[PDB]
Amino acid sequence: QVITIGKHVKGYHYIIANLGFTDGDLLKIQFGGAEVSGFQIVDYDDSLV
Amino acid sequence: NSIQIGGLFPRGADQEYSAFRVGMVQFSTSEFRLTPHIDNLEVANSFAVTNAFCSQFSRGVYAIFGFYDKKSVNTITSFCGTLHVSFITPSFPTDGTHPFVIQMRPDLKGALLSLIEYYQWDKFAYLYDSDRGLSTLQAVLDSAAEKKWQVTAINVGNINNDKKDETYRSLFQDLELKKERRVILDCERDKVNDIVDQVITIGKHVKGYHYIIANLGFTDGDLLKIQFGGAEVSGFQIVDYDDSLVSKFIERWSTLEEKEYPGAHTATIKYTSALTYDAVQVMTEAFRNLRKQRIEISRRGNAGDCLANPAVPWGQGVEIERALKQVQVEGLSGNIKFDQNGKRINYTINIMELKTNGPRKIGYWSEVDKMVLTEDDTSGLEQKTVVVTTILESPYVMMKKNHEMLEGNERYEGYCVDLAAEIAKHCGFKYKLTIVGDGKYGARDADTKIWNGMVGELVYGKADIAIAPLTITLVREEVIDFSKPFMSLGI
Amino acid sequence: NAFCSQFSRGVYAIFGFYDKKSVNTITSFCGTLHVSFITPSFPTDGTHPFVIQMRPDLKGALLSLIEYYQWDKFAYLYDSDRGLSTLQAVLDSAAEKKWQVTAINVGNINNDKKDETYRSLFQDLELKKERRVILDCERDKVNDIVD
Numbered sequence: 001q002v003i004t005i006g007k008h009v010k011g012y013h014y015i016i017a018n019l020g021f022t023d024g025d026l027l028k029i030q031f032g033g034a035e036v037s038g039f040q041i042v043d044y045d046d047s048l049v
Numbered sequence: 050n051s052i053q054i055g056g057l058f059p060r061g062a063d064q065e066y067s068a069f070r071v072g073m074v075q076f077s078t079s080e081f082r083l084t085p086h087i088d089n090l091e092v093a094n095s096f097a098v099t100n101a102f103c104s105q106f107s108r109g110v111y112a113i114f115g116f117y118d119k120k121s122v123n124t125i126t127s128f129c130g131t132l133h134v135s136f137i138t139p140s141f142p143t144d145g146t147h148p149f150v151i152q153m154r155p156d157l158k159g160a161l162l163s164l165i166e167y168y169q170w171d172k173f174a175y176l177y178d179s180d181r182g183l184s185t186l187q188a189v190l191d192s193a194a195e196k197k198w199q200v201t202a203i204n205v206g207n208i209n210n211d212k213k214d215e216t217y218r219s220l221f222q223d224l225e226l227k228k229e230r231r232v233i234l235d236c237e238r239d240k241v242n243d244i245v246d247q248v249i250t251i252g253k254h255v256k257g258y259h260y261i262i263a264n265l266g267f268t269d270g271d272l273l274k275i276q277f278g279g280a281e282v283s284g285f286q287i288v289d290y291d292d293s294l295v296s297k298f299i300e301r302w303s304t305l306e307e308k309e310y311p312g313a314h315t316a317t318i319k320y321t322s323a324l325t326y327d328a329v330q331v332m333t334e335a336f337r338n339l340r341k342q343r344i345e346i347s348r349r350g351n352a353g354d355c356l357a358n359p360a361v362p363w364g365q366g367v368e369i370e371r372a373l374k375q376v377q378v379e380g381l382s383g384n385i386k387f388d389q390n391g392k393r394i395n396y397t398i399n400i401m402e403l404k405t406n407g408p409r410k411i412g413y414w415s416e417v418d419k420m421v422l423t424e425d426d427t428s429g430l431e432q433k434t435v436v437v438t439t440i441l442e443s444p445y446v447m448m449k450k451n452h453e454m455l456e457g458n459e460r461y462e463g464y465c466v467d468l469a470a471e472i473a474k475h476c477g478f479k480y481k482l483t484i485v486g487d488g489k490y491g492a493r494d495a496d497t498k499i500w501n502g503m504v505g506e507l508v509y510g511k512a513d514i515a516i517a518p519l520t521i522t523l524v525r526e527e528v529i530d531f532s533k534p535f536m537s538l539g540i
Numbered sequence: 541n542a543f544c545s546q547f548s549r550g551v552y553a554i555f556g557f558y559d560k561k562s563v564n565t566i567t568s569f570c571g572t573l574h575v576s577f578i579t580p581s582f583p584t585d586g587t588h589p590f591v592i593q594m595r596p597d598l599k600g601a602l603l604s605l606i607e608y609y610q611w612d613k614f615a616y617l618y619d620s621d622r623g624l625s626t627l628q629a630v631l632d633s634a635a636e637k638k639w640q641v642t643a644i645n646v647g648n649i650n651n652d653k654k655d656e657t658y659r660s661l662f663q664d665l666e667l668k669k670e671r672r673v674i675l676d677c678e679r680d681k682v683n684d685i686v687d
């Protein structure tokens with residue numbers, strides 16, 4: 001709904017309070033201009049991971 | 050009289066072919082019938098066009114209907130001007146006046162020039178598609194030179210699919226260099242629905258931008274994407290849904306089965322299919338008028354090779370085209386008339402602007418008359434120029450010597466004039482400078498409390514505000530109010 | 541007619557010229573029938589098979605000349621008959637290098653008016669007082685316009 005009403009330009013800023021930050025969709029607002037940060041507990045770089 | 054005709058159709062124009070099948074029996078059969086031999090073949094290969102054309106000429110039909118592409122228009126004109134066979138099409142208009150070609154699409158270019166002059170731009174960009182031709186590009190550049198415009202045209206059409214997510218980003222970021230604000234698109238609906246999606250992904254549909262679609266099916270594409278945006282989108286329609294026969298065809302079209310006619314069980318329709326439906330009307334009116342004048346079209350023999358050296362044609366087709374240019378009926382686009390060549394005249398195009406509730410019209414444009422807006426003034430909130438009363442006093446409020454040549458708020462000059470300009474600058478409202486009638490400051494009446502002068506103009510709701518040399522007293526706070534005092538004085 | 545006639549004659553190698561209106565016809569026939577065609581005419585745009593063409597490209601050298609003379613603002617007079625490929629080409633570089641380009645068609649003017657129409661054209665150029673002109677025509681139109 002944000003991307004429909006056009007509120008993801010440069011200037012805005014967003015914080016997701018979850019654990020699966022990339023577990024949701026992010027290709028929508030990736031190229032926007034806004035800046036999005038969050039949190040992960042599952043780091044894909046590790047060996048057993 | 051089942052008369053042999055020929056039909057050319059691309060492999061994918063299913064809505065148009067189904068609309069042709071609808072219009073076939075939508076009105077016919079008190080008389081002559083038609084023999085449509087259909088060729089669901091391609092349009093890019095002019096060799097394929099040639100093969101289909103010589104096949105239908107070996108059939109020996111009396112008229113051929115279909116589409117064409119820009120890589121085939123020369124082939125169609127070259128064979129038709131030779132063999133005198135009248136050809137009718139809904140496609141983009143030809144450039145040169147050619148004989149034996151009747152073309153169903155109206156012009157766009159004069160309308161588009163009218164629209165640009167109405168919005169009064171000076172500088173913009175112009176994304177075009179090569180595969181629809183460049184006639185509009187040639188047209189806009191001349192008037193751009195004359196009307197001192199600054200045009201940044203860019204080809205976009207030859208971009209492949211596999212890079213068609215980053216090409217557009219590079220393109221619009223190059224448009225960000227000059228900080229473009231005004232775009233004209235000129236594409237097919239597929240390219241429109243691609244480019245709007247890429248714009249809405251990169252976030253360029255806020256308030257500030259502005260867009261113009263150069264097509265005929267303005268609402269035939271998707272508009273729920275950028276409807277709530279902030280940007281402003283305008284276009285053009287030739288199929289107006291408000292009319293009686295239009296809505297009759299809408300109901301008749303919506304009630305049909307999708308399985309029998311693909312792409313038919315919807316609410317709206319393509320303008321191409323609409324012109325196909327009207328083409329059946331014209332094509333039947335032709336043979337109707339020939340049986341009115343009782344002129345026999347007996348071929349009286351077979352046709353032969355399309356490569357006949359030299360081939361000799363038959364001028365009853367010239368009389369066919371002569372009767373074709375005189376047809377004047379009503380249809381989905383409205384009234385139709387033709388020139389001496391096969392181009393449409395006497396048409397009308399509605400200007401369609403997108404709003405929050407959805408699309409709406411603001412005016413029409415004719416073949417001869419310019420843009421006539423329909424005066425649709427739904428602006429319910431107008432900031433009223435507030436009532437500012439004062440009195441002439443030097444140097445508070447003074448006349449100017451050239452007040453007759455000047456107008457209104459420009460006529461007055463003084464300390465109060467400058468002050469009122471400052472107040473209106475700081476508060477953002479509109480105002481109009483007026484004068485008290487009786488020429489008094491104002492006091493109350495004995496026994497009736499009738500405040501005259503500038504007092505009763507504010508007491509009795511007449512005037513809105515008074516920036517003027519007025520003195521704060523005790524007897525004036527009861528009826529009106531004052532700000533903090535701004536200039537000291539005494540008797 | 542000529543092409544079908546000579547293929548009925550059983551030609552092994554076809555040669556000839558073409559204008560802008562027959563180009564699709566020739567490339568369509570040659571792509572189908574796989575017959576080697578050779579030409580000195582204007583080069584095409586899409587990569588088409590069985591078409592060998594002697595006339596070299598011009599657009600890169602012309603752009604290079606533009607960069608060498610180091611211009612920003614100029615007029616460009618073109619004819620349609622030879623094609624519009626260079627017109628499409630220079631406008632992209634105009635968008636990139638932020639040039640001020642004025643392009644005007646000349647090719648439709650009939651011979652009965654080619655003393656005053658050109659005069660009106662140059663007066664409209666003098667409304668901006670252009671100084672840098674690229675002509676793009678054939679030799680006949682060049683000799684007609686320089687006079």
Ligand SMILES: NS(=O)(=O)c1cc2c(cc1Cl)N[C@H]([C@H]1C[C@H]3C=C[C@@H]1C3)NS2(=O)=O
Nearest residue numbers: 464519520521532533534535536537538539
């Ligand atoms: N020197 S003068 O008469 O023009 C003049 C007189 C006045 C001025 C400013 C000026 Cl320049 N502002 C004051 C206001 C400012 C603040 C303090 C009192 C009022 C609020 N009122 S005033 O005392 O009427």
